[PDB]
Amino acid sequence: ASVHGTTYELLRRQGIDTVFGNPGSNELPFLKDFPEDFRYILALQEACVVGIADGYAQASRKPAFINLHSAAGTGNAMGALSNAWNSHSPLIVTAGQQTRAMIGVEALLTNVDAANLPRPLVKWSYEPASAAEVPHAMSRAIHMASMAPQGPVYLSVPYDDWDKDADPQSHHLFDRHVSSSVRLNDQDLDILVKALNSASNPAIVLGPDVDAANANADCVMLAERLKAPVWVAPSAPRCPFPTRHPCFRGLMPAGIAAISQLLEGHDVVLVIGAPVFRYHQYDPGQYLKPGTRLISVTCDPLEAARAPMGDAIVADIGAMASALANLVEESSRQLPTAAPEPAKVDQDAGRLHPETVFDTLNDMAPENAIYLNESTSTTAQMWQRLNMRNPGSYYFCAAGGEGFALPAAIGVQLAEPERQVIAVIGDGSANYSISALWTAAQYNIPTIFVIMNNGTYGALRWFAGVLEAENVPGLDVPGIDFRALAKGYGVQALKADNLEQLKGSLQEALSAKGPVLIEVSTVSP
Amino acid sequence: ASVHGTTYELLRRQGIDTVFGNPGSNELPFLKDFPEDFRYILALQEACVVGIADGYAQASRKPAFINLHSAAGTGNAMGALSNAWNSHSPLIVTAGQQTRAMIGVEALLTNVDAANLPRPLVKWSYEPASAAEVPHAMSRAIHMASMAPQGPVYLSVPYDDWDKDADPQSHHLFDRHVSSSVRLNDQDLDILVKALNSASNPAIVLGPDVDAANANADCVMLAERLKAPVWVAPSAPRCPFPTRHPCFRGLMPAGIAAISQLLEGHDVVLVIGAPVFRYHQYDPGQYLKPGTRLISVTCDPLEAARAPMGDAIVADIGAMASALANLVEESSRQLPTAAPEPAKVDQDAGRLHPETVFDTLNDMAPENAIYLNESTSTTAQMWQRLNMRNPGSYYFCAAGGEGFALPAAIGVQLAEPERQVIAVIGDGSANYSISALWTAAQYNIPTIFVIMNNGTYGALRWFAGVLEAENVPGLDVPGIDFRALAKGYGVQALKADNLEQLKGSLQEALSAKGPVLIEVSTVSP
Amino acid sequence: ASVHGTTYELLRRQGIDTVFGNPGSNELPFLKDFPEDFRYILALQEACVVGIADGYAQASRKPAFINLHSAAGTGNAMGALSNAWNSHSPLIVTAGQQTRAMIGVEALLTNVDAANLPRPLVKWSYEPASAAEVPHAMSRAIHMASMAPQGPVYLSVPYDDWDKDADPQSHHLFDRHVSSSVRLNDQDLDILVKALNSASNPAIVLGPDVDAANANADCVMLAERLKAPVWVAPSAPRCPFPTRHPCFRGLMPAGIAAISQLLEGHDVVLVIGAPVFRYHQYDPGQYLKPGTRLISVTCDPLEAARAPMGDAIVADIGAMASALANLVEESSRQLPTAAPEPAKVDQDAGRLHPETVFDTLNDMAPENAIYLNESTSTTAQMWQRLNMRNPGSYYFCAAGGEGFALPAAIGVQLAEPERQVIAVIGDGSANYSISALWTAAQYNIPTIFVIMNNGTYGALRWFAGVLEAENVPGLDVPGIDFRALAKGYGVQALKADNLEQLKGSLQEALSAKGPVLIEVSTVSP
Numbered sequence A, B, C: 001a002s003v004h005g006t007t008y009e010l011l012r013r014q015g016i017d018t019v020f021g022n023p024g025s026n027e028l029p030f031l032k033d034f035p036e037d038f039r040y041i042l043a044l045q046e047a048c049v050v051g052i053a054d055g056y057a058q059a060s061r062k063p064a065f066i067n068l069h070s071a072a073g074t075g076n077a078m079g080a081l082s083n084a085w086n087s088h089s090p091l092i093v094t095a096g097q098q099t100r101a102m103i104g105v106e107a108l109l110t111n112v113d114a115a116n117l118p119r120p121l122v123k124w125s126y127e128p129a130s131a132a133e134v135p136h137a138m139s140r141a142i143h144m145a146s147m148a149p150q151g152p153v154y155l156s157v158p159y160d161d162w163d164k165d166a167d168p169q170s171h172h173l174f175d176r177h178v179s180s181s182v183r184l185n186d187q188d189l190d191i192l193v194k195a196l197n198s199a200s201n202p203a204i205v206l207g208p209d210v211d212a213a214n215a216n217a218d219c220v221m222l223a224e225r226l227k228a229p230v231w232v233a234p235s236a237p238r239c240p241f242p243t244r245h246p247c248f249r250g251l252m253p254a255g256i257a258a259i260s261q262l263l264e265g266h267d268v269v270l271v272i273g274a275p276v277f278r279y280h281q282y283d284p285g286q287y288l289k290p291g292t293r294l295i296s297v298t299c300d301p302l303e304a305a306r307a308p309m310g311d312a313i314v315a316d317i318g319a320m321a322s323a324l325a326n327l328v329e330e331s332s333r334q335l336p337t338a339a340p341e342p343a344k345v346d347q348d349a350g351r352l353h354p355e356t357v358f359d360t361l362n363d364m365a366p367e368n369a370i371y372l373n374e375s376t377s378t379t380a381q382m383w384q385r386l387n388m389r390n391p392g393s394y395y396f397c398a399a400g401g402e403g404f405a406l407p408a409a410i411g412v413q414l415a416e417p418e419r420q421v422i423a424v425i426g427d428g429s430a431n432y433s434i435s436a437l438w439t440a441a442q443y444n445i446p447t448i449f450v451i452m453n454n455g456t457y458g459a460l461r462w463f464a465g466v467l468e469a470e471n472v473p474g475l476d477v478p479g480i481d482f483r484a485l486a487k488g489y490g491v492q493a494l495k496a497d498n499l500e501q502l503k504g505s506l507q508e509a510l511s512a513k514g515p516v517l518i519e520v521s522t523v524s525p
């Protein structure tokens, strides 16, 4: 068998059937004779390729396979890799290298010192020492991406390797099963459960690895048994809990002092599937107030090591959430009372307040919609106003890197063809990965893109306020016609300058058979 | 003085007055109180920021200063850095980091292991150990980018550093002058000159560092004195010689055997300012034929080390070209005869042959036009058909990385306001950095963008032919309306479906007062 | 509190009370005011410092703390770090850096790009961005070294940081408990147990992480219940099983074909706590024969990923071994029969055969002796001839790096003051870390060093035979007087030129109150 045949067999035997790519000449010997059971999803720029693959992997809860061109293609994707690293996204990033005979002379398209290029944003990065090693290196890449804590990995392959003979012993790779589905030993798990059972006023904080593990329902059972309020850890990349469940208390503020004040009076705080904590603004004070102790369950040793307070347990989130939910006692405390609905903000017949947009989306969207957020100044209102009952209903760029939501929304929609995806993206953020729209048009992936157009980088005006920073250039982005950009890439486009038009546009978009972009005129901050 | 005040003083004293950027919150404390003598050039995505800065630096022949946001912003720019590394572009890339007090907890927007992120595509990469060190680190960055061999450098700065007190000894940084303008010692230079004077049939090969050094005129004098044919080294990022001078012989084929056959019968081949050689296709054979010896002058030790043949001298290209041109004897051989004009290809009243496009551009463009090429399947025809008399008249992505020409053409036009810039870009390549168009509209930078629309990744069809690779996915890019994309970003747009319309569109574009995009319907390969 | 006071408090609260070091000026501000409850163990060269700390950590089963001088001190230790990486040794390596104010100018003793220096041989490598971050960075280092898979970590600290004020919130670091004591979820553990219970002819292979976890007794119970033969995985750094238990089958040959032939006919092979596999010689063939399937339990994702065959489970070895031993059925198969004793090799009254040395050590040493091996050509005979009943009885350089056993034997003896340590070291290997002898003399650590003196690098003669490599320089090491070297460093020394003298020397050494070196004249290969 050839290295080409052996590698595609390994991929299919490991459950991979889709290649997200932007091709180049170092990759043509891999992509030739493309197998009939695989599909190739083309995107026009590599940040878009990786963003699409990332949304697909996060929604599918399985690894996604990417093929990029050498150093330039890899490099164009590295902002997308920064988000994937923070979201623990299982991405297998492959890039083609020059033929082995010209690597030394650094022919055009040689990826020099290739394995160092995507570091430090990958769990594993490698170029094989021979063609016959390629399938074994691909096997390492698959398992490295997929083991807890999941994350992106990188493999560089010289183009001449594909046609070489494979090692006949490579067949032992095909059906390897690797598990990291582990939980704390019985004795120490019993100690933890007793501490939870004994707590007088517990609180629960959930992060994105809960939603990645589909541990959401087990966390609902846990919160109901402990009769405990539940918050989502700050800077949330996913939604790990039903947002109208009576225990839900919302998104935590991303500040040290704000979090310790919120948790004051809670004697035990159990954090599951989150870093402790992804603070953002610098809000110095106590990490925890006297009387509060913290216990973190994380799938990532790096998170356990860097927490500034608390105990930690490094284990699989799915296995731990299931075990805790089934072992804790039902507390005799009263179940927390649901938060009140948000107030309606006053809205005239002009430009839309973001609150009006989210209320209207909540009114009109299906109950199993999936939302993506890259509307950076409106995140708090979004979390208050969208009822997200189901797992996999929310994505936000995990490293704060713009250019995620537009392509990721296409990958999520590909992963979840029966759930309507609605990406809410600011006019600034929309530009970073604008060409991803073409992939939605070409493959008819029916994502709805809602562009919140207020003419400015609004969140940067906010942070400038926090810092008291004046005379800052580069904050305004006037003069972008998003309906023309959508037309440019073949996507149907609508404009909403007021509430009547927003409702009409959403009705049309929800009825459409393909992707739709709605440009919404929102109020300037 | 503050670190902020001291750093801007260092920048202005070192000749820097422009910041190319896309802002974020870690950068607001740097950008606040922006000095009135500086300008800020915003672009909407970081590949575009860096591409604009790169064209500006290459055309200006001086360092350009960039400010990006943390890891995601840096990462979005790394494909652009791969081109800048190959073109020896003096780019000072700065990125904002989290405040020092939250780096350890890895708050959102922390750039983890920052200096490793852009490696291996930078000459120097650093994060200072204290705020007071920031001006000295910026001084290192400026000089590292600017010394031969020039190249990109990276500096990560925690946002809290800017408001701290500077070291009063930082003033010694302001006026430092660092020179690498060096040439081979007299005795060995005399040996070289004698070898050139004695050669019976010399040839000259020039690369991009000739144009970077503005050594073009000295190379013309050298070729005239030696009565030697002149070729441009393969995969050329710049044009180092007048293309209708009688000695000019064109762009070398990027293959080992093709180059040794071309040079057969030349006893001494002098390569100046090029890697030896930037081959592309694998065309195995002799590096040089018997009877040919090679001497390379390069500004880059890495190039001298990796050449597979020949002697090398590591020195400044400007200083060496001037010394050789002034020291060699005038040979009594006859001056080479100019190459014949290219033939006119048959053109009907339908879609345009690329040859027709280049002939028409050559007919209509000013004699001091500047061209950029990202029309990958038409490069040979472009080099045959455009008369480029002057230095700084041609740019092509030095690492082969798509997404360079569109933004770089805006930076070149900013650097050269009195020379009309004409970027010739394929329909595939146009998407990688499409949002750069907005910067041309906003700042009214009057670049002309000629989109060669043939619906496919044509060069990848070509390389597939070379490899004999069939059943390759992802090679077609139908369904892009470039006039709508231009409208989206505020740029006037024209379409040319035939020759009459191409001439009319070019006449309108050349008369316009702002940037213009022309979508040209070209023949499918 | 100062950073100095806070850091020592963190160390003592995390169970660290010993610093293994070789001092320098960047470290004096850390070592000053050394706390009265800590001890400092000086060694004269850094390979020795790290080797001593490594033996101490491996025998104690807890992290060891090291302090080295800048880049040169770190660099002198990097061969020792290569062994520590392979043995999963929990080592916290700290190195002093220049004061922050002169790092930029690269004053003498600046460790440039410090975190990159020990890569790729560390799990985590870091230099803090401010003095107040130092305790939190030390906390990260402690937990990173200690979490599964354990391994070395590196922290570089500018010398001026120690006297700065600590963050008052650093107290939350002191009592953090971090656990990785996890095992496979119940459902999948039940599937594994059923596969073991159903196997017709199981085999067990154990590696060093069994001994690190003190899982040895649980593995004995497991082997007795399954009535299965037990081998030690190749290139063994530790002994995970009693070597005269009836199930024991010895050290596996370090070859692909040799291992698959050994395992032929075993239907399920369970590997616990080993890479699959640490082959050495290239012995190509089948990874496993038809009819054999493999299941690996490893604490290290990198091991699970790179195995060329089998299923894998990534979990704590102690937790998994205990669970399996307690859950499997008692098989009705007959218990394996013990291997026969080794034969006595013919020995005349001259130089000693290594077999005679090991037989005599086995006869005379206490039953709870601990052996270290760096006698590279005699490893197979050592494993056949020493009855090692107890855990923690054997250490061998895990990366094959010479210079481990001599210093590690001193650290093991410090960790286990009531178990006599006997290091068996070749005359070649003894030189790499010879100065470690001084630490044994100074602190009166009563290790016995047995130098096998045959005048040559015997194993390299063996491998030369395998390769059929002739005319190789540098294989002989004549002219070393090991009694004089021992005298040089203050250690009592004896010579044994024949068996009578070997017995007399061992009797004297075993009766001594301090360290003793015995130079044994062994037969030339």
Ligand SMILES: Cc1ncc(Cn2c(C)c(CCOP(=O)(O)OP(=O)(O)O)sc2=O)c(N)n1
Pocket (backbone or CB within 6 Å): A079, A374, A375, A376, A377, A378, A400, A401, A402, A403, A425, A426, A427, A428, A429, A430, A432, A454, A456, A457, A458, A459, A460, B022, B023, B024, B025, B069, B072, B073, B076
């Ligand atoms: C790759 C990249 N570049 C720049 C930024 C900085 N950035 C930027 C540019 C923001 C403004 C986004 O504007 P928007 O129009 O999408 O939304 P708002 O107006 O609601 O802020 S928020 C933010 O952190 C970033 N996070 N990522």
Ligand SMILES: Cc1ncc(Cn2c(C)c(CCOP(=O)(O)OP(=O)(O)O)sc2=O)c(N)n1
Pocket (backbone or CB within 6 Å): A022, A023, A024, A025, A069, A072, A073, A076, B079, B374, B375, B376, B377, B378, B400, B401, B402, B403, B425, B426, B427, B428, B429, B430, B432, B454, B456, B457, B458, B459, B460
């Ligand atoms: C960042 C990046 N991604 C992908 C490629 C691969 N690539 C691609 C995608 C080419 C096709 C360009 O198509 P075009 O329309 O711009 O021009 P032609 O039709 O004349 O080839 S040529 C080439 O090397 C690349 N060089 N750089």
Ligand SMILES: Cc1ncc(Cn2c(C)c(CCOP(=O)(O)OP(=O)(O)O)sc2=O)c(N)n1
Pocket (backbone or CB within 6 Å): C079, C374, C375, C376, C377, C378, C400, C401, C402, C403, C425, C426, C427, C428, C429, C430, C432, C454, C456, C457, C458, C459, C460
């Ligand atoms: C740091 C280092 N350098 C060199 C070697 C190579 N090496 C060497 C030099 C060996 C010979 C050891 O000789 P010895 O006297 O200790 O024992 P034998 O005579 O029994 O081989 S075995 C081996 O792998 C090594 N493993 N580690």
Ligand SMILES: [Ca+2]
Pocket (backbone or CB within 6 Å): A036, A037, A038
């Ligand atoms: Ca099919």
Ligand SMILES: [Ca+2]
Pocket (backbone or CB within 6 Å): A426, A427, A428, A452, A453, A454, A455, A456, A457, A458
């Ligand atoms: Ca906005």
Ligand SMILES: [Ca+2]
Pocket (backbone or CB within 6 Å): B036, B037, B038
């Ligand atoms: Ca001004």
Ligand SMILES: [Ca+2]
Pocket (backbone or CB within 6 Å): B426, B427, B428, B452, B453, B454, B455, B456, B457, B458
């Ligand atoms: Ca094209």
Ligand SMILES: [Ca+2]
Pocket (backbone or CB within 6 Å): C036, C037, C038
């Ligand atoms: Ca004491």
Ligand SMILES: [Ca+2]
Pocket (backbone or CB within 6 Å): C426, C427, C428, C452, C453, C454, C455, C456, C457, C458
């Ligand atoms: Ca020896």
Ligand code: NA
Pocket (backbone or CB within 6 Å): A116, A117, A118, A119, A120, B116, B117, B118, B119, B120
């Ligand atoms: Na990198």
Ligand code: NA
Pocket (backbone or CB within 6 Å): C116, C117, C118, C119, C120
């Ligand atoms: Na290193």
